[PDB]
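Researcher: Batch entry, complex prediction.
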Amino acid sequence: LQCTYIHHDHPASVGSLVGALGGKVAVLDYPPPVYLHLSGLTVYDASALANPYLCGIPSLSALAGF
RNA sequence: CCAAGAAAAGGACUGGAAGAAAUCAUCCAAGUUGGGGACUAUUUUCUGCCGUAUAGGCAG
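Model: Structure tokens for the complex:
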């Protein structure tokens, strides 16, 4: 599957699994293939890590929030 | 009431030295473009005079 790795400093201080994995943990990576009407909005530095398991489109819970 | 709310990666640099791609080599043969035709239409430039005068100047 498409994936990448997230690093943790001091693995022994986070948990059994993170230590066993040497501080490198794999996650999924699935980016996109790129009435009131709001046009032209720009966002700087959005969080691309939706949940600890998946990278890609920002969490939908955040848009409902907005 | 947006995995909520706040965050300065900054500083210093010297990759340099030498060099030999050459020898030969043949594109040829024939070939049929071809017969017809309204640019003048509802358009404006017409009439006298000076002067040796198709020169050169003026009144309608």
